[PDB]
Ligand SMILES: Nc1ncnc2c1ncn2[C@@H]1O[C@H](CSCC[C@H](N)C(=O)O)[C@@H](O)[C@H]1O
């Protein structure tokens with residue numbers, strides 16, 4: 116397996132045994148309201164005379180405090196000292212190691228098999244206020260750091276793991292994680308622990324969902340490798356005007372944070388209804404009102420291809436195809452060919468002119484608006500088309516809409532042009 | 547005073563149910579709790595009112611309330627009984 | 628893979644056959660989006676074949 | 680006596696209605712005798728059902 | 735890359751069990767004084783007006799109403815537990831009142 120990097124990872128930061136506080140007021144439980152009548156569990160101390168271990172308040176015991184995410188305090192609870200619900204205080208972390216991943220940098224792996232719901236490791240860091248968090252965030256953005264190291268302890272109180280913390284900062288995001296972060300109360304303080312969502316075996320990577328608030332920061336692509344990956348690291352953005360459509364899809368249409376701001380600012384603030392942030396329903400009026408500019412960047416072409424593969428809306432596809440009509444850069448078109456844009460355009464056709472959720476005249480206008488760039492793109496070999504067989508779809512749609520003769524004649528010209536192309540030679544392989 | 551039965555607010559009745567050890571609350575129960583509270587208050591207030599009217603007074607005192615409650619088998623300690 | 632140095636400069640293959648070797652390497656890796664005129668994809672394919 | 684003892688477990692030197700309610704409701708025969716009385720500012724004894732708790 | 739990881743939310747029941755312990759440990763009044771006083775005055779208005787209500791009478795009425803509601807909710811929780819549920823419904827309220835004899 117991969118070589119251990121535990122000491123090398125440790126040398127990168129100041130190791131902490133416990134959370135540090137900017138001041139004594141921050142991090143206090145109940146917003147600083149000292150519950151003098153501390154919640155004492157009624158458990159009787161169960162001392163095993165052989166091992167001398169107080170087995171009270173165990174995993175399978177009925178300790179009320181354990182269920183309510185509160186740790187027993189020695190000298191105040193009936194469970195006695197050294198009970199089995201002092202995991203944070205005793206710092207009984209699971210055994211873990213650090214290994215260098217292929218793309219994510221350092222990552223945490225389980226040195227032993229860990230049971231379900233077992234406490235893995237306490238997330239450690241400096242407890243800071245909002246202004247200190249903003250200052251440190253600005254400093255790190257100036258430093259160009261490409262790694263998140265902030266977690267929200269609670270409202271207005273954050274934990275920074277950049278310069279000082281624990282091994283938990285090396286845990287990587289997974290869209291189908293095996294662990295999760297939870298908030299617990301230890302004494303008059305609040306802690307953030309990491310617990311096992313399932314059974315984890317030795318050598319497996321330990322990961323948790325980041326559920327990250329960007330606070331307006333740009334999306335970062337997710338390389339977790341999970342099948343259920345959304346492709347980007349993120350979470351519910353700023354409270355309003357921040358997003359109307361998903362980023363890749365919005366940037367595919369040429370829209371950005373400013374154009375998504377402007378529509379909501381012009382109508383929602385002037386007594387016209389815009390729903391909350393939800394991409395399950397497409398607002399056609401926004402897409403129609405959006406401005407369109409030609410594409411000259413290949414990453415934007417990849418975002419366009421992703422939007423074609425994802426969005427089912429008729430109007431978004433109409434405006435993307437119109438933007439492609441404005442687009443005339445040959446390199447972007449070659450990239451779209453590499454991305455197999457014809458494959459996506461086949462489904463885009465099929466959904467609209469084979470399945471009929473719209474009107475025949477509007478579908479005819481769509482078909483005339485989508486045949487043009489197909490006629491215009493550079494093509495040199497039917498190997499390109501063979502990755503899509505879009506000609507079959509063209510035959511099906513000219514046969515279905517045979518009464519609309521301009522579409523039929525355009526598809527005639529298109530298939531005549533495409534049939535002149537040869538096929539790129541592909542070396543046969545032994546069988 | 548016009549329809550202040552809504553003054554018994556939803557968090558308050560939630561707290562009252564929570565003291566009884568109830569974990570989950572249905573959405574339709576609040577009108578029922580308001581109704582039964584109105585019925586109980588109606589009965590006790592009626593008995594206190596006729597107690598006061600027999601005493602030739604115009605102000606209901608705590609003694610009438612404790613008397614009415616104790617007559618319904620709901621004896622209250624701490625208010626001069 | 629797109630760098631100034633070349634993988635095939637450490638072999639006996641003549642520079643006139645570099646595109647031939649990259650087409651062999653690309654076709655061996657079952658790639659289908661490849662086009663003969665795209666030298667970049669050829670270099671990526673041969674780089675992933677020789678140094679996966 | 681029972682109220683002073685219940686206060687003593689609460690580390691208090693002031694007898695309040697809470698301690699009186701605790702003393703009355705935690706004794707079987709006293710609960711039987713004072714069944715139909717409500718103690719003002721007495722509160723409720725802590726009681727959570729067994730199957731109400733999660734697993 | 736200055737984003738913040740969120741602490742997520744609690745499970746349903748954890749904060750419920752917490753506040754159960756908190757309200758069963760503490761003894762303050764749970765009904766607001768002034769709306770309850772207005773409600774008592776509204777009920778008393780229906781029989782004979784110009785009826786002044788001493789503060790001690792209103793406090794005694796509030797204490798009795800809270801005790802009655804707490805007992806009724808304990809019985810209704812027992813009813814819900816008997817029906818293999820953890821959520822109380824109005825039918826359990828009606829059944830508890832029926833068996834208690836308050837409702838005929
Ligand atoms: N699945 C994933 N794909 C890509 N980058 C990831 C990732 N999980 C975590 N990261 C990166 O790691 C950061 C968290 S800090 C994790 C440890 C760090 N990568 C290191 O080795 O020093 C994230 O902000 C992101 O930049």
Ligand SMILES: [Zn+2]
Nearest residue numbers: 156158172178
């Ligand atoms: Zn315990």
Ligand SMILES: [Zn+2]
Nearest residue numbers: 172187194198
């Ligand atoms: Zn304990």
Ligand SMILES: [Zn+2]
Nearest residue numbers: 290337339344
């Ligand atoms: Zn992912």
